[PDB]
Amino acid sequence: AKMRISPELKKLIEKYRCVKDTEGMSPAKVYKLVGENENLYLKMTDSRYKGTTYDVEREKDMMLWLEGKLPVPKVLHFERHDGWSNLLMSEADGVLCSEEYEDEQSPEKIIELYAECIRLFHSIDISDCPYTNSLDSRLAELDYLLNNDLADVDCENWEEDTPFKDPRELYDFLKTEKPEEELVFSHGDLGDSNIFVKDGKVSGFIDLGRSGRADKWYDIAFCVRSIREDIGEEQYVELFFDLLGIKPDWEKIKYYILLDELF
Amino acid sequence: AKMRISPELKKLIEKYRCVKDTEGMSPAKVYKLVGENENLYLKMTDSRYKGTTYDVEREKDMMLWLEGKLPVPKVLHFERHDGWSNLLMSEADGVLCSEEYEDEQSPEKIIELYAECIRLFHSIDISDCPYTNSLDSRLAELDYLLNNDLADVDCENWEEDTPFKDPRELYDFLKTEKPEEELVFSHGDLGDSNIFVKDGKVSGFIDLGRSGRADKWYDIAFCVRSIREDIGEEQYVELFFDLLGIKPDWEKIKYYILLDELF
Ligand SMILES: Nc1ncnc2c1ncn2[C@@H]1O[C@H](COP(=O)(O)OP(=O)(O)NP(=O)(O)O)[C@@H](O)[C@H]1O
Ligand SMILES: Nc1ncnc2c1ncn2[C@@H]1O[C@H](COP(=O)(O)OP(=O)(O)NP(=O)(O)O)[C@@H](O)[C@H]1O
Ligand SMILES: [Mg+2]
Ligand SMILES: [Mg+2]
Ligand SMILES: [Mg+2]
Ligand SMILES: [Mg+2]
Numbered sequence: 001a002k003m004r005i006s007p008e009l010k011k012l013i014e015k016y017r018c019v020k021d022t023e024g025m026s027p028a029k030v031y032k033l034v035g036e037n038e039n040l041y042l043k044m045t046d047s048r049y050k051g052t053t054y055d056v057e058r059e060k061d062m063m064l065w066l067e068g069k070l071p072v073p074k075v076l077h078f079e080r081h082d083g084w085s086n087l088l089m090s091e092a093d094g095v096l097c098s099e100e101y102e103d104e105q106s107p108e109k110i111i112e113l114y115a116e117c118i119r120l121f122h123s124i125d126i127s128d129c130p131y132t133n134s135l136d137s138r139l140a141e142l143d144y145l146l147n148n149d150l151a152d153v154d155c156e157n158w159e160e161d162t163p164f165k166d167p168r169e170l171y172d173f174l175k176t177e178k179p180e181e182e183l184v185f186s187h188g189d190l191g192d193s194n195i196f197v198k199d200g201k202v203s204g205f206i207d208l209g210r211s212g213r214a215d216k217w218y219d220i221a222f223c224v225r226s227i228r229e230d231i232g233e234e235q236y237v238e239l240f241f242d243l244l245g246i247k248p249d250w251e252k253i254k255y256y257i258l259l260d261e262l263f
Numbered sequence: 264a265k266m267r268i269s270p271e272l273k274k275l276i277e278k279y280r281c282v283k284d285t286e287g288m289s290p291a292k293v294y295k296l297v298g299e300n301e302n303l304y305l306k307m308t309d310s311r312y313k314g315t316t317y318d319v320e321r322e323k324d325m326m327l328w329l330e331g332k333l334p335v336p337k338v339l340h341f342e343r344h345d346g347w348s349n350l351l352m353s354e355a356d357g358v359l360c361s362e363e364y365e366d367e368q369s370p371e372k373i374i375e376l377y378a379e380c381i382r383l384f385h386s387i388d389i390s391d392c393p394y395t396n397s398l399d400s401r402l403a404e405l406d407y408l409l410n411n412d413l414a415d416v417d418c419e420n421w422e423e424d425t426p427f428k429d430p431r432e433l434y435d436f437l438k439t440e441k442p443e444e445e446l447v448f449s450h451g452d453l454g455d456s457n458i459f460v461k462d463g464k465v466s467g468f469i470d471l472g473r474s475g476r477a478d479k480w481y482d483i484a485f486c487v488r489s490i491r492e493d494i495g496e497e498q499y500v501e502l503f504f505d506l507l508g509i510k511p512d513w514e515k516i517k518y519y520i521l522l523d524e525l526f
Contacts, residue, residue, distance in 0.1 A: 002431065004416055013421055014421070014423040018418040020418050
């Protein structure tokens with residue numbers, strides 16, 4: 001009777017053995033489905049996230065549009081079912097970036113990876129991109145998340161050392177300090193758990209709900225954040241920009257890093 | 264202004280470093296608050312769980328009542344704020360059982376442990392217990408949870424080899440096969456993740472939202488389930504019952520194991 005997945009989807013997933021992904025960092029439900037020939041992945045988001053960058057439907061649209069443009073998983077099945085948005089996809093090719101690195105430190109290799117991602121993204125034609133994740137679009141949804149108590153679970157935002165007394169004060173800041181934008185393909189959440197590597201080169205991208213048109217400093221800022229909190233040495237933030245062949249815009253960088261605090 | 268915690272509580276935890284719990288296999292948000300001299304814990308549940316065995320307020324009431332009866336964390340602060348039930352507590356004394364016996368091949372000691380918890384519980388006077396978790400009560404809230412899509416849909420249930428085809432079929436079974444109850448003190452979720460041992464003796468119980476009056480076979484059944492999950496040696500189940508000094512009632516043991524499937 002009442003279920004989160006349709007009988008057809010259940011039929012498609014029956015031959016597989018399920019293993020709920022143990023991470024917990026977003027509202028989405030991620031399940032690894034192990035089979036005798038391959039593994040599939042089922043990602044799901046509830047009604048409260050409809051139309052937001054968290055919505056797997058939006059993620060599915062981007063995943064379909066990115067085929068032949070970026071190495072991304074194949075869309076096997078998508079559905080809207082009893083409030084839920086369900087996506088069945090293929091497993092990404094290669095090794096997860098966070099694994100290839102882990103303890104075996106190869107700093108330069110990570111920076112090169114991030115640089116490779118940025119250049120690759122800039123070569124992508126966005127003339128027919130299904131989504132425009134402009135600051136106005138992001139702020140509008142952030143307002144929605146705050147009004148409905150759906151914004152990121154405050155744990156760090158409770159500390160005294162927080163620059164903004166509350167989410168709204170941070171929101172107001174982002175709304176007033178909104179910088180100019182130059183739309184380019186944007187991943188939306190460039191990080192070590194969303195990138196896959198094979199033979200030193202990017203082999204795949206996942207977590208595409210926040211992907212679409214956005215300013216180029218958005219992803220760049222994320223790389224900076226990743227480099228600083230994953231590697232450690234600020235010298236690799238220097239190498240990062242050397243590889244890109246540009247000078248860092250710290251004002252725009254600090255802003256985008258701030259924009260992601262509430263998500 | 265809009266916050267999940269009150270100004271008072273925010274002030275009470277400023278000197279602590281918040282680190283969100285990795286398990287998160289429930290609706291409740293758990294945060295380890297790292298201080299210089301000690302660690303505190305903050306558990307919180309949203310309004311959709313109000314009045315259920317998940318509601319941390321219900322957990323607070325049982326934590327206060329259990330003081331002096333069972334080794335439990337101290338209630339430092341509680342409050343209902345914007346629909347959120349918030350509980351600030353002290354760190355449990357001793358070592359987590361899933362760590363004291365972490366990969367440590369000593370399955371007999373964890374049995375002795377469970378046997379002791381059961382013995383402890385049967386010594387607790389329940390005459391003035393705050394909650395009665397009778398099957399009527401449990402099935403009533405389960406009904407509410409299923410209707411509102413708040414129950415736990417263990418992804419493993421989507422396998423082609425599973426017993427019940429959907430949540431309601433299992434519910435109808437639980438509603439029809441309801442055994443006879445003899446009330447005693449029940450933890451509600453007796454497992455290696457909610458028990459602490461210090462010197463070969465239970466030093467702390469946590470996760471008390473499901474605590475109250477219930478049939479004795481409930482906690483005992485949970486012990487059987489965990490015993491079987493650790494090792495495929497049914498011999499240890501016999502040992503457990505030798506320690507308890509009773510003949511196992513399989514119809515009730517099976518019944519309670521199934522009841523926990525949707526929670
Ligand atoms: N198609 C896939 N191929 C391989 N691994 C996958 C795939 N989908 C998900 N995963 C794995 O599961 C994790 C979580 O999936 P993800 O799509 O990032 O969910 P999420 O909650 O949006 N993640 P985040 O927001 O980064 O916490 C990823 O880091 C991978 O480890
Ligand atoms: N007072 C405490 N002292 C020590 N550790 C604690 C305390 N409260 C929570 N924890 C830790 O955090 C984990 C989750 O807390 P718990 O109260 O079990 O939340 P939960 O989501 O109800 N858990 P479960 O339903 O078992 O998944 C516990 O297994 C402990 O590791
Ligand atoms: Mg991700
Ligand atoms: Mg994500
Ligand atoms: Mg627990
Ligand atoms: Mg629990």
